């Protein structure tokens, strides 16, 4: 047995985002690290770990990750959701980290090994002008990326060019029709300039109503996007049947998921082509493996959410999952800055459009705890989540 | 308790339509006003209120709108339908008016308050020529409207350019193919001239057979109408699945509904994008709130029917519902003439494409009883409802 | 407008449970109180309110509850789940409390009034012997209760009479077959002694596997329980189809729900007869009203979860919902003790099997903030949630 | 890398069945052992390993079990089926053995560790009389078993009490009605004598036509069998819907499966409560983990086939899977005789109704190569598979 | 009775492929020949026949083909799959040959005679250039073929112009996008040059993911291919519904099938227009007839797989089945080489686009036993089955 001797939760903001790490110490002296990053509510996740998971977990056998996951998930009776799941994810990843270290193996080797040499990577280009897009796309192409998520225009902030009511309620405003029009124009221009040079992805980020999504699918399907992401919010994915029945568009969805009821009908009915779950939002590696296998039976492929608001520990974990799970398709990546790299040393970066899994024992990335102390948590409003349509209505952000 | 002391029903015809208002007096001294407008059969609604609802309601507690509504709906054993529901609606709306006045709140604040600053508005442009259309559209755009329901041609009357049988039966004649041809051409012409300057709506008004409706949807989907309204009659909406499976066209339906069985399967199967119910036809505010909530769970949005054959009291009520219900989308424009404005003082008018909810206590619009007496009920035959196809057969009007 | 001036969150444990109250102060000087009680993780809910909802909400208009609810729900981007929802519920209830106070009306009158005189109530009898059950049942019957949830045996703790593995993992042990056998025997004995004197309810509390649930339904259906509650866990309710296809048993489910995807298919497919949601777990009054209306269209009735781990504020709120919503069926009740009554004065208690809604302005129950300070939060392990079957497996608790 | 240096396949018959072991040697010096037992066609599996899998695998990296499995499955283009899957299983299991040995962990710890302390076990009682049954049951109960699979009568052989045609075709005869009659009587008798003392299982072994299966389910459901196994053959499992819609009987199925199309719709439609796959028939540990996860999402539990025609290596593997997979339920008992114990040293035996996973590195059971050579393959005709009904027609055996 | 006196299995490789023939001798002195060709695993098939089917079959009555098939199929208990089915097929075909020889009739006359004069034939044109394709196409049209399966490019081998990971794992590489692009261009060019001169077929050979298949279907439907073959792998055919709901493309699938669960739902749901099964893979003539009839009821037509890896005996059998079964559509043919013709004399060749059934007694084609000895089995690694995507992942080959 390997008895858990401590549980710690650290919030660090080396750069733009409040990142959250969980650290598990064991009587073997082997230490694990995991990602619990829910950037919008980090103090809630920390409270959850410090006040509840810690006294629950100290004294228990770290070897039995599966029991610990099943036990943790139901421990508050009420369950699922972002605060509990991220806290559990932090522990779950750290426990797998310890197991891999004790096995003296890279994490993906514990799983049963590689099913691919490395995972393909897509990056992000966003500009308010086509010329600006071209500038970023050109750089990415020169670096060997073959997949780029492109966006024309920025959506939010003050309603400068939007016909609102007289005294619009405070919020981040956009117009769905302007957004649709700019996006179609973007695809048309990118295909005219670049042809089939690279794969174009685009993130709808739940901006649209169902009728707008169906129209939009028919408008861009001719451009064969690698995928169109979050074309609807999680609560309206039954409307995907309307799209799947009449459009060939490739669809990805699910970074928002933190309850299994959100994805089961989605996958069984083949409503998307790629699942986009944020691994820490679904409770860590343990459920990620199961969900990977579930998708596989239905022919659904995997593109785990990999935003900047996630530790490099979490990213390395996703790369281990991505080189192992046969139905993994692509990894999202954004560049790390120097502070982040200092707090989380040895974070892999894409090489010629590929991310390579770590080959040392464990996850392969840890947190430098002294460095992390230099960057304490900092309150952020996240004003973009107060997203409003011209009439002042809230829309899923 | 707030005991009901009197119930009255007034039919008034300030301008082109017979309007119906129910007036509820209480022992608190607070009076409520409601819309019961079924313009085609007004004496029947008045008989229903005066002879049956009045002796039922006098003496009962106006506070308990929900009990009174559930009780009223089943009071005749047989139920649903346009005459009973309209009479009940008049009472139901007046009871809400009373409750809001006693609470000293605008009606929408009772409901739980605003979910938007104001509701967007669409107006109506109809002409026998394109230039006549352009004339009306230019005027509306200049007034700030962003949504216009357009129709080229008038359909009905003597069969002048229509090959009928030798001695055609008396009726109001049209040719469905001429109607389709003109409407497709109209859409084409408007997009050429105006591009994406405004949202174009069109009301099919149940003119078509299902195969025609399906053909029409494929013919106009490319023009992205904001919605195509009543593309089928209420009894044939299962045919919408054929449309939904192969077309992206945005659909609205339901102004004719007066029985819940007409809408449940519609909404459950996502057969339309907007519900168009006439609030008084479904029994008033009480069922309108439930239906709005019902639609919201399925992702269906709301565009309550707001024709000229409705009191300004009913319009105000609809704007109260529209600024409250989160899934409300748009409100139909009704320009009020001098006589109607005198009978129903303080009726809101759109300002720069928006209708604003009233902010005084209650509904915010009452009927001037003296002014209404000046304009008594007048029989109208509504010949357009005897709608006939070229072979002389009735079609749903 | 009524600007929010403060937001406070208090945890108090006057008796057995950590209760959580949210208090909203406004520039009008009118103060609201709401329930945010997630007893197993109270510090997490408090963190959520103090650190996040408070700076978000101060300065905003308390009148617009609907916008504030829609805005709050999506404010962390990721959403749903027990920690966020309870925090939002606390604010939502307090906002309705303020609106009712300003309207000078009892909460249920804001909603549209009563649809019943009072709500029927069921209470709880639990013993390890039939004789002990009879003793409690006899008292309840004498007090006028007509509905009693009965349980024979206590399930959990050390595996004294259970054949486990040699060195069973620490946990709370029970045997599903012993539990089934005791429960069937209980119903058989109660019907033999009491006949149809009262309505018997029973809470399966997700103890069973699907095959056991189906067997159990067929075993007790002859006893016509008023309902059998939580016969399956939330993740396995599709298995209810097997039961609904072959058994007449009345079913209730849903106290665990905190994501709408958990209940939509459940209700649309008529898989249960009563919905059991914990109002604070689903985000407060605002979504409770909508869910009430949703259920109503499908003929599903309401029995909101009313456990001891909920403030009397929350209970009074449920009674307001129960006398208003036409499809409300029954209210669960457990007696308050003197400390709890001191901290939450004027809490209604059942009278002859009925709970009467409060008739003063507002919710009708507040928290005495000095009294609450006498009873600070106290860590509880809740060892019963580590529920294990004889082989040491975790089972949903 | 850990390069494969040799692949061997040994058929050994220590006792009643031809057993098949695959042995994988690597350059690390670490040797793996796996089960490839298809007892009816052992020379075919050995040809498959020796002639095709050996030259394919030598030189490749044993670490990457997942790639090797995906590659092996499609290597012959045509795929699935009992000969190929068993050969692949032998390799797959040996590769997992190797990985666990290198990690210096018991196999189940690699997977993520335990979710139960040990797995419950059922044994088998079969006799031509009830008293003979009682004899075996009494012995098993006294040994600590709580689950016994019971069968009254032996079915097959010469048609002694069976009205066949004049000159019946050579085969193993039985009468389905005699079988049903004896089994119903057996259940009745066991419940009268033993009541609820133990769980009774029964294996129908695809003996019945669908109308017989449905009749039988209704006849024995009252006796609450722990499961009724293989009530239909694999090709007729859609007939299970008729059973599921009207009966509570608990069902197990799937020992015959060797193609995923055989189980997907089964599990998706909840047609059984327990999956019974033979791990080597589905291709080894790698697909067994995925299938367990797949079943878990649908609430289906696992009872892998553990017959005597399987190596103790395969049994140990199944116990490793059974203590890991949370939805594992029970393991079939196989008493090992002296010769088999010598060939496969250290095979676990049930202790008080439980099988405990091995705790040394690797699978924990190997084959003694010298001992196995003592017991070479011996042809068996397995006459029972020529199973005939009274009219002389083949029925699935 | 016609007692089986011997069973033999000969592997012969006169040209590029290991071919497998089963020979059945009877006491009548009449000898039958059948195809058991599974070219990738021939030694496993031969073991199956020699070690198991032979001692099973000798002594039994060859007259009763139906019983012999039902008996053979379940004789190993576990069943279906390519090794067992091919062995059984060789026997089944030889028995049908024997029966037809005894009746002194061509095989298809046994079945009930011709339903057509002859079967239309398609050939294969494949090249890395369009002009290379044109030469082959031109050759075929001159010979009277009216159907040609066309392929531009060769896919596999070393990843020369493919961006792989740094050290790509050994395998046969292709890029799906490159393949789709070339194939779409091929269709475009062929229709430009040839118009509707001939029917163009194309074999996707399970190279694509579902989202790619759906895109491809929409890209080529305008070119009206006679059929697009194997657009998905057998385990993913439920994705065909997405294609069938939005595309008019003609589809064929099934050469991989060796388990009826692979085809039933496929055909019941009309997911393909042509079934493509390999007759020996499904177990011979006996199940080919039933499957032909099953398809016919559903309106599905037959294009049995007729690759070079099949004996001319098996090809003759397919022509007998094709002139008999009313729903047979077309026969694939590859030109025979001289050594193959020597070993299997008198094999029919297409004449002006038609294949004519043999008119002598029996199948019409036998194996020259002495000639076959000149060409013993030779190992081949079939490296193309290790098909990898650019990232190193195995894809179904
Ligand atoms: Cl921010
Ligand atoms: Cl808007
Ligand atoms: Cl008129
Ligand atoms: Cl406790
Ligand atoms: Cl157990
Ligand atoms: Cl035998
Ligand atoms: Cl096989
Ligand atoms: Mg995204
Ligand atoms: Mg209309
Ligand atoms: Mg409960
Ligand atoms: Mg069995
Ligand atoms: Mg092919
Ligand atoms: Mg379609």
């Amino acid at each position: 047995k390997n008895t858990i001797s401590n549980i710690e939760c650290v919030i660090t903001k080396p750069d733009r985002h409040n990142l959250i790490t969980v650290i598990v110490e064991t009587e073997s002296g082997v230490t694990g690290y995991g990602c619990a990053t829910f950037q919008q509510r980090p103090l809630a996740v920390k409270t959850m770990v410090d006040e509840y998971l810690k006294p629950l977990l100290i004294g228990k056998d770290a070897n039995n990750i599966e029991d610990l996951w099943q036990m943790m998930m139901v421990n508050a009776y009420w369950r699922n959701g972002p605060v509990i799941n991220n806290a559990i994810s932090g522990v779950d990843m750290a426990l797998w980290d310890i197991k891999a270290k004790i096995a003296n193996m890279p994490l993906h080797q514990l799983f049963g090994g590689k099913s691919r040499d490395a995972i393909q990577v897509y990056t992000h280009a966003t500009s308010d002008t086509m010329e600006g897009l071209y500038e970023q796309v050109d750089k990415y192409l020169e670096q060997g990326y073959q997949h780029i998520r492109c966006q024309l225009g920025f959506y939010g902030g003050v309603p400068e060019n939007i016909q609102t009511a007289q005294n619009p309620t405070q919020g981040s405003y956009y117009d769905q029709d302007q957004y649709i029009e700019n996006t179609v124009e973007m695809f048309k221009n990118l295909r005219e300039k670049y042809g089939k040079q690279f794969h174009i992805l685009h993130d709808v980020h739940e901006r649209l109503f169902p009728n707008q999504a169906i129209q939009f699918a028919k408008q861009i399907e001719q451009y064969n996007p690698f995928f169109i992401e979050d074309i609807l919010p999680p609560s309206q994915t039954e409307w995907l049947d309307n799209i799947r029945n009449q459009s060939s568009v490739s669809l990805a969805l699910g970074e928002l998921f933190n309850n299994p009821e959100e994805w089961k009908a989605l996958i069984i009915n083949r409503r998307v082509d790629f699942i986009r779950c944020h691994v820490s939002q679904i409770g860590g590696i343990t459920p990620a493996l199961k969900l990977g296998h579930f998708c596989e039976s239905f022919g659904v492929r995997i593109a785990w959410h990999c935003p900047p608001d996630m530790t490099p520990i979490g990213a390395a974990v996703n790369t281990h999952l991505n080189v192992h799970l046969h139905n993994a398709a692509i990894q999202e990546h954004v560049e790390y800055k120097a502070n982040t790299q200092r707090v989380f040393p040895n974070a892999a970066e894409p090489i010629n459009g590929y991310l390579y899994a770590s080959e040392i024992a464990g996850i392969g990335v840890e947190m430098d705890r002294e460095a992390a102390q230099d960057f304490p948590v900092e309150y952020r409003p996240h004003e973009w989540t107060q997203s409003r349509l011209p009439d002042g209505s809230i829309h899923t952000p």
Side-chain angles (χ1 to χ4, degrees), chain A residues 227-288:
Chain A
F227 63 61
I228 297 295
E229 173 186 350
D230 292 7
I231 204 171
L232 288 167
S235 55
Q236 290 171 355
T237 57
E238 290 203 319
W239 285 91
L240 291 177
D241 287 351
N242 299 67
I243 300 177
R244 302 299 253 184
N245 287 331
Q246 71 179 282
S247 177
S248 56
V249 69
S250 176
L251 297 180
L253 211 139
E255 70 190 53
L256 280 164
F257 293 169
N258 43 44
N259 188 307
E261 304 306 306
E262 296 176 309
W263 72 63
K264 291 182 302 191
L266 190 77
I267 293 154
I268 291 159
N269 294 294
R270 313 175 316 281
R271 286 167 175 153
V272 301
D273 300 295
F274 300 93
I275 200 72
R276 292 278 292 147
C277 291
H278 193 111
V279 176
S280 73
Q281 283 282 334
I282 68 166
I285 291 170
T286 295

Side-chain angles (χ1 to χ4, degrees), chain A residues 179-196:
Chain A
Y179 159 76
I180 284 156
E181 183 179 336
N182 289 342
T183 304
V184 170
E185 177 78 2
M186 178 202 72
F187 271 96
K188 179 185 193 306
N189 290 338
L190 287 172
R191 286 304 190 207
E192 275 170 3
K193 183 171 159 67
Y194 297 99
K196 317 198 199 76

Side-chain angles (χ1 to χ4, degrees), chain A residues 51-104:
Chain A
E51 301 292 346
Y52 303 104
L53 296 189
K54 170 183 186 175
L56 171 69
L57 290 167
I58 289 178
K60 295 180 167 48
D61 190 356
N63 293 342
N64 299 322
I65 306 179
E66 184 71 20
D67 181 63
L68 286 167
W69 192 88
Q70 301 288 346
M71 185 275 290
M72 278 191 285
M73 280 292 289
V74 302
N75 189 256
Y77 183 58
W78 288 278
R79 49 205 193 246
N80 307 120
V83 181
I84 294 177
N85 287 7
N86 271 279
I88 291 180
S89 166
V91 170
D92 185 78
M93 294 192 197
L95 292 177
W96 277 103
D97 189 23
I98 287 153
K99 189 177 281 286
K101 289 171 171 161
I102 288 173
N104 195 27

Side-chain angles (χ1 to χ4, degrees), chain A residues 119 121 145 319 333-338 341 346-357 365:
Chain A
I119 190 79
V121 175
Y145 291 100
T319 300
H333 200 85
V334 183
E335 206 159 74
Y336 304 115
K337 305 209 188 98
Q341 289 169 307
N346 306 324
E349 305 190 301
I351 305 168
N352 200 37
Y354 283 95
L355 263 176
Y356 293 80
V365 176

